[PDB]
Amino acid sequence: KKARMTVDKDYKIAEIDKRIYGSFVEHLGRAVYDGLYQPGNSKSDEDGFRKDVIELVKELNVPIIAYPGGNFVSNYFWEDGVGPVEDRPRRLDLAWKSIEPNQVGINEFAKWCKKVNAEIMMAVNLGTRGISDACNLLEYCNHPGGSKYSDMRIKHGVKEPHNIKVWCLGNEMDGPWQVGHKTMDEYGRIAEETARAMKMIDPSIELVACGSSSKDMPTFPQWEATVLDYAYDYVDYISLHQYYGNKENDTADFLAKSDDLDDFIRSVIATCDYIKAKKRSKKDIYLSFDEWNVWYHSNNEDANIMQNEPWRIAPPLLEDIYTFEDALLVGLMLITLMKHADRIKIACLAQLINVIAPIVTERNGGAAWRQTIFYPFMHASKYGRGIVLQPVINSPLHDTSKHEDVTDIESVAIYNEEKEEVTIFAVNRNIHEDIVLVSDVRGMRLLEHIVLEHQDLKIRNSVNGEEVYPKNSDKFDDGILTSMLRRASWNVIRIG
Amino acid sequence: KKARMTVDKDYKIAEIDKRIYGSFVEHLGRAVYDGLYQPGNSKSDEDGFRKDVIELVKELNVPIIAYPGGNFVSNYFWEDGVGPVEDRPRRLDLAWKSIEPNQVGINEFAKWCKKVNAEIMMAVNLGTRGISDACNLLEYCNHPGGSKYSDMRIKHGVKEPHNIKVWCLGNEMDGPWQVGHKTMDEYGRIAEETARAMKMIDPSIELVACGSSSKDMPTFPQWEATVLDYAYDYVDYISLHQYYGNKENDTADFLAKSDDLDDFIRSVIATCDYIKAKKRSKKDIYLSFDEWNVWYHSNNEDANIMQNEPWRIAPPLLEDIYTFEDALLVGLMLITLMKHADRIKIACLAQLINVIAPIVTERNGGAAWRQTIFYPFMHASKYGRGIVLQPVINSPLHDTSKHEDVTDIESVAIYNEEKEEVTIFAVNRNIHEDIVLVSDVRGMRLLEHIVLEHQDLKIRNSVNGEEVYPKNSDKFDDGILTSMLRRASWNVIRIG
Amino acid sequence: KKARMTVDKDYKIAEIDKRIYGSFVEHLGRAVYDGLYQPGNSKSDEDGFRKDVIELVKELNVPIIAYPGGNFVSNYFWEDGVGPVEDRPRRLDLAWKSIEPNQVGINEFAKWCKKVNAEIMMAVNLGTRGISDACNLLEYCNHPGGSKYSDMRIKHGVKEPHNIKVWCLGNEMDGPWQVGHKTMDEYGRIAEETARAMKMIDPSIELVACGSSSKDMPTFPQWEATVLDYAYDYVDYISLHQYYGNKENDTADFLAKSDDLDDFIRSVIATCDYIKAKKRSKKDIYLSFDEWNVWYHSNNEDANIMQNEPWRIAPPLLEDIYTFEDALLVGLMLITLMKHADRIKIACLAQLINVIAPIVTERNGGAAWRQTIFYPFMHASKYGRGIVLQPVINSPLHDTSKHEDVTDIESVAIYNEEKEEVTIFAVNRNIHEDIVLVSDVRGMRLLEHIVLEHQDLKIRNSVNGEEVYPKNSDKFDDGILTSMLRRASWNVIRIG
Ligand SMILES: OC[C@@H]1O[C@@H](O)[C@H](O)[C@H]1O
Ligand SMILES: OC[C@@H]1O[C@@H](O)[C@H](O)[C@H]1O
Ligand SMILES: OC[C@@H]1O[C@@H](O)[C@H](O)[C@H]1O
């Protein structure tokens, strides 16, 4: 019933990179078609983009969105979605057994990223395509003009290069669910050669190599070690993916799963450093956590679609509707990323619109509303820029079904020297007792205390209204912050 | 002198899959051009199909034809043979050093197969091509509409998809004569990834993975083990090829070679089950014997043609003229296929028209006639449907030049329970003595005794008449079927 | 002081294959643009070729020219250099961060070769292309007509086929500087497979399989051994590459490096001879030294142009200005080449025009002079055809700073039956002492004694005049020819 913290200006971890507040839009389900893109609609601008979703994306201050996949890219032909809309084929999406009409291509989605204040992180097909087609698209997007593929982009109606900064070398081809699945050695070899060639057209890009699909894949972490061994001198990040679920209806254990995520991150970092010594590089690989969220609800009601109503345009796939306990994990995941901002410099909540998303529109026409997990993300993206200070913490301990010695309070401090604030994110994973948070701010006044709490852990939102929203609530003395955090609650504490 | 077997319904091996009476048409020699396709011929038709040869293959009751190869497939670009006949190019067929004019392509051949009451078994180029092009072809042939390659078939004049059921992942790439030769690991991976992609486009197809070119390749059967190791979960058959020849003028030995065929089949079956163990799979790989015949006569004039007379359209390649003794071995092989109907479920007599074939058309508008091998095949495909009874047999033996303890009689009884008939296929491999076959038919009225004999082993057929042809002949008490099998004869004995 | 050598028509070594006097034009810097092709210059013929450079090439008696690369070929798409010049696209050359206008293509450069009395040695792209694309280019060039890619060459204005006699399977793909770099086993297999299919199109070509980029690559000569182990049956040569430089400004050790070149060649022959035993072959693989020259001068100014003036057309890359000592190493190299005429049957001075070349043009206009190195290549190419006689030479020795026991006088004798000449090529790597070469000719009147000397080792040529040029100088009784060889001199002594 007591839990104490030391925070210390003079004791850094790293400076947060704003691209850990990134997200992700795949050509999956309704993410694009009647998601961000709804042409004739009364809520959509001239270009066909819904203006109300554009606003909700903007409240999340997302600086970077991954596109277009995801399993999708592994058999995507980027040429299909550029040029005259009349001349674009309908193609089979083998990943999500639906049909892709390809009205939103590179140029269309590059425009929507303007309107939401975000850079693209582009994924090349390394599944059924390779080196030279990754080069072409890089030439199309980044070369100013005067060559076959740059001029083709100008002719298509975009005179200035998109100048895309970060690229993913294909997408998690280690799974058996994946068109053009590759072995460690096959991918390490191809990621290397594609990295080498792409960096010859545009030496200012950064390239992400695909890590394991999940830490439960038998080949993790040898996949990482291998891939990196091949391509160390030509890449800048290794990617990680993790989704959690609560099909076990074990809220206590489900909230303990951010400890698996901490161990996962530490394992990938170990692998990197290991390969480093093997190469005697002075470089560090950074981490691109370009897929994370909660995802378990819509599992059964996606199997029905593919295939008994298959090859639909834009079927309602992966349409998870998130509960309160879910947003508790998201916050715990954000907090765990922030504790690792020294090697995680890019992260993507998967995904942004409709498909396991914080934003949702209703089917067949629209509405637009905030899921439970919108707000923890928002608080993180807004008050979580600056410097991360070490979690010098002692807090109570509790065990759960399949987890022992779980901290009752995860929390970290982010110190923005610019705005002379220190924001303290904290989550109480004790579903039962309430625990108060002493905080030895060896600083150098309390500014506010936002909170997200609820009685019913299974409570969802809906088009019809928000059951979960930041209620400014609660209650700091000498330079000692005293704050109380209810059983099972998300908390942002602020100081001026 | 006396050979005995007991024949009991309650002792089965399997049910015959009618697909073991299939054949094969390659873009080889005069098999298509100056064969089944002769556009301005009086005997021909609306589509250029010789109607006399359409009737001859109907006689053979062939339910499934592999197409278009064969070594030809490994460098074939299937789009060269579809769409506006004028726009189709002339291609070098590197395999058989011919020129392919592509006047007959997918759709042409596909509507010759209806006319002869058969279905395509489609081979995809995995020599100089790969996953993406296999998917393109599969979608073209099987996806209904509203997608690039299915609308392309529709625009091409075929409004209904061909819905091709069985597809062969390439062709025998283990040999050094193949353009695009692969090692076993190389091929095993591309077969695995193509199988996985195709089954995402159409889950109802069956896939066959390529086995060794022949049992005498030093990579046999480790090839079959490596391929299946990679592709087990996504493919349904493993292919087998076998040819026999009598270039040593030793008829006694030449007819014992069906014993070596049995040994070969058991090795592929064993290799399969071993890998089954590895994978801990409940699934059975079945055998696709998609290339078998006698083939030795024209070995020389083929070498004279390529390459002294290279790059012709429709050279007269691989035109074996078949002997009666050859027709004996073919029958001995069919019986041996039958005796393995439980694992062998697709088989292909290589090939159907003109090229090592039971049907010849003479040349430059030709004639059309049945070779000796036409007939044992017709007796098997016609009377060989139903259930195969375990050949409980004790018959005399004889050594040969290179084989020991070789049976004199080779029979298999198969039972059709709706027809209320039981047919005994039986061959006397003793080309000296005559043998009486006492068959205990555990009750259960004889219907006929068809026979294929000749005094002249090396006799042929020709356009000027048929020296070998079914002679209704011969020569059943209580329940003992006694019938006399002449030296070097093919016998089909029916009770009813 | 004195040095004894004896020739002998009886002590042979090999007939000179005139293809040891070959050269090489890459699409690199000003070799093509503002080099041999200047389509509105006052000195350029109907097609655009500077007729002064054509006359200068014709002086060098170059029978065979490698093209288009070189690193350029590893991302080249040969279709971009054929057809309407209006429709040819401009391409990023990743190799040299240049734009490729593709105004000179296969067909253009084939005409240039007629005018210089030379033939193409063609490189296919095996970095980002493969079997079927080398098959198309070989059908374009060598098939007479009546197929897709030969008819296409006809449509392009070359009715008869170029019939390219030797082809190069890719280019030095072991460096980390090259687009599409491959490993030993990758290249070994792509080479074996490409060779196998090409030789099915045109059996009369010869194929060159790439060796290492240099004798110093760690992978040397396991590369050579592995590649030949895959490709032995279908390739005909292994390539070699060596360049020299004097950045250390040690003249006498720099004239010594030809000993390293001899050692280099012997290792490769050892390696071929080892795989030959392994294969139990009766075939020898022959050596194609298709990149050799001195290269060290422009290494400063070459990086200053990339990437700081990147993506220019025709930048001044690799414009080495050759001194006199340079011409002397080039002379020894040609001697060491000729000395190995039994295994070296193709050799290319790299490169021909402006890029590390013997012929230069001044830029943005014209000029055309001869670099110092022009002259030893000229003498060798003109007087060095016939039979290389085995040299027996007792010559004095000398040490240098990093070479021990270095011949003072290096010499070799070529004998032409059709002129009973016996041209002798000798050089004095002793920059200090003068040596006289008695030559005991067991022939067989003296004809000339062309000489190449100068007292400033660092003296160059320029547009403003050649300071280094052949002087008919010097200074043969009955049996003995006596010839004084000044220090640092190249000599070509004749007999008739
Ligand atoms: O993000 C949803 C899907 O989950 C993962 O398996 C894939 O990367 C992605 O396409
Ligand atoms: O059936 C004729 C040929 O023989 C086999 O070896 C080839 O696969 C096939 O094309
Ligand atoms: O001089 C030739 C160039 O330099 C070499 O290193 C490359 O092979 C080639 O492109």
DSSP B367-424: --EE-TTHHHHHHHHHH--SEEEP-EEE--EE--SS-SSEESEEEEEEEETTTTEEEE
Instruction: Return the residue in C73, C87, C94 with the most chain A beta carbons within 10 A, the one to mutate for interface testing.
Output: C94
Beta-sheet strands, E only, within C25-102: 64-67, 91-93, 98-100
Give the residues across from C369 on adjacent strands.
C360
* Alpha-carbon separation of residue A463 from A30, A358, A363, A459, C268 (angstroms): 16, 13, 11, 14, 75
Cis upstream peptide for B218 (omega within 30°): no
* Alpha-carbon separation of residue A216 from A220, A221, A264, A451, C67 (angstroms): 7, 10, 10, 34, 51
- The alpha carbons of chain C give a radius of gyration, in whole angstroms, of 22
Which residue, C112, C43, C124, is CA-closest to C352? C112
**CA pair distance B147, A93, nearest whole angstrom:** 10
Which is it for the CA torsion B353, B357, B359, B365, positive or negative? positive
Residue extents of the structural domains in chain B: 1-16+385-496, 17-384
Fill in the amino acid letter for C470.
P
DSSP B379-392: HHHHH--SEEEP-E
**CA pair distance C291, C333, nearest whole angstrom:** 12
Phi and psi of C373, rounded to 5°? Answer: -65, -20
C-alpha A40: how far from chain center:
30
Phi and psi of B314, rounded to 5°? Answer: 60, 55
Helices A374-383/A324-338 angle, 10° precision: 30
Which residue, B235, B130, B132, B270, is CA-closest to B186? B130
Does residue C262 contact residue C243 with C-beta atoms inside 8 Å?
A: no
Residue A172: active-site member: yes
HSE (side-chain half, CA atoms, 13 Å) at C417:
6
Q: A412: Cβ–Cβ under 8 A, 6 or more apart, which residues?
A: A335, A338, A339, A388, A389, A391, A424, A425
Contacts of C261-265 with C-beta under 8 Å, sequence gap 24+, read C261/C292, C261/C333, C261/C336, C262/C336, C262/C339, C262/C340, C264/C215, C264/C240, C265/C240, C265/C289, C265/C336, C265/C340, C265/C343, C265/C344
Among protein residues, the one whose CA lies closest to atom 8 of ligand 2 = B70
DSSP reduced 3-state for A123: strand
Query: Which residues of C lie inside 8 Å of B (Cβ-Cβ)?
Result: 130-132, 135, 139, 143, 146-148, 151, 189, 193, 196-197, 200-201, 203, 233
Task: Outline where A321-479 has alpha helix (H).
Answer: 324-338, 374-383
**What number does CATH give the domain A1-16+385-496?**
2.60.40.1180
Rounded (10°) CA dihedral C454, C456, C458, C462? -60
DSSP reduced 3-state for B324: helix
HSE (side-chain half, CA atoms, 13 Å) at B334:
35
Residue C291: active-site member: yes
Give the Å distance between the CA of B292 and the centre of ligand 2: 10
* Alpha-carbon separation of residue C346 from A389, B151, C15, C16 (angstroms): 68, 53, 13, 10
C197/B94 CB distance under 8 A? yes
Beta-sheet strands, E only, within C396-474: 397-398, 406-407, 409-415, 424-428, 435-440, 446-452
DSSP, res A78? G
Does residue A21 contact residue A384 with C-beta atoms inside 8 Å?
A: yes
**CA pair distance B34, A87, nearest whole angstrom:** 41
The ligand placed nearest to the CA atom of residue C243 is 3
Give the residues across from A413 on adjacent strands.
A389, A424
DSSP reduced 3-state for B326: helix
CATH architecture of residue range(s) B17-384:
Alpha-Beta Barrel (3.20)
End-to-end CA distance of chain C: 27
DSSP C241-301: EEEE--TT--HHHHTTHHHHHHHHHHHHHHHHHHHHHHHT-SPPPEEEEEEEEE--TTHHH
B311 neighbourhood in chain C, CB within 8 Å: 146-147
Match 């679609």 to its residue by tokens.
A305
C-alpha B276: how far from chain center:
26
Does residue C142 contact residue C201 with C-beta atoms inside 8 Å?
A: yes
**CA pair distance B143, B150, nearest whole angstrom:** 6
Phi and psi of A434, rounded to 5°? Answer: -95, 140
Kindly report the nearest CA distance between residue A186 and chain C, in angstroms: 11
DSSP reduced 3-state for C417: helix
Q: C356: Cβ–Cβ under 8 A, 6 or more apart, which residues?
A: C293, C294, C295, C298, C318, C320, C350
DSSP reduced 3-state for C237: strand
**CA pair distance C452, C375, nearest whole angstrom:** 8
**CA pair distance A165, C440, nearest whole angstrom:** 73
Tell me the two tokens of residue C335: 């001697």
- Binding residue ranges of A for alpha-L-arabinofuranose: 26, 71, 171, 243, 291, 351
The helix or strand, by DSSP H or E, that contains position A259, with its residue range, turns out to be helix A258-279
Approach to solving: X-ray
Does residue A427 contact residue A331 with C-beta atoms inside 8 Å?
A: yes
Beta-sheet strands, E only, within B96-212: 98-100, 119-124, 166-169, 206-209
Q: Which of C147, C193, C233 sits opposite B180 (nearest CB)?
A: C193
Kindly report the nearest CA distance between residue A133 and chain C, in angstroms: 10
Does residue A489 contact residue A477 with C-beta atoms inside 8 Å?
A: no
Which is it for the CA torsion B66, B70, B73, B79, positive or negative? negative
DSSP, res A364? G
Does residue B382 contact residue B274 with C-beta atoms inside 8 Å?
A: no
Q: Which of A143, A196, A203 sits opposite C307 (nearest CB)?
A: A203
**CA pair distance A34, B222, nearest whole angstrom:** 52
Does residue C58 contact residue C117 with C-beta atoms inside 8 Å?
A: yes
Fill in the amino acid letter for C343.
R
**CA pair distance A58, A55, nearest whole angstrom:** 5
Task: Provide residues with CB under 6 Å of ligand 2.
Answer: B 26, 69-71, 171-172, 213, 291, 350-351
Q: Are strands B91-93 and C369-370 parallel, antiparallel or unpaired?
A: unpaired
DSSP reduced 3-state for C150: helix
Q: CA nearest B189 in A: which residue?
A: A182
Q: Residue A70: CB within 6 Å of ligand 1?
A: yes
DSSP reduced 3-state for C405: coil
**CA pair distance B6, B480, nearest whole angstrom:** 9
Task: Outline where B28-176 has alpha helix (H).
Answer: 51-60, 106-115, 131-142, 148-155
Fill in the amino acid letter for B204.
S
Q: What angle do CA C399, C403, C404 make, to 5 degrees?
A: 50
**CA pair distance B375, B373, nearest whole angstrom:** 5
Fill in the amino acid letter for B467.
E
* Alpha-carbon separation of residue A206 from A20, A169, A282, A285, C160 (angstroms): 15, 10, 17, 11, 49
Q: A16: Cβ–Cβ under 8 A, 6 or more apart, which residues?
A: A338, A341, A384, A385, A386, A387, A388, A414
**CA pair distance B481, C101, nearest whole angstrom:** 85
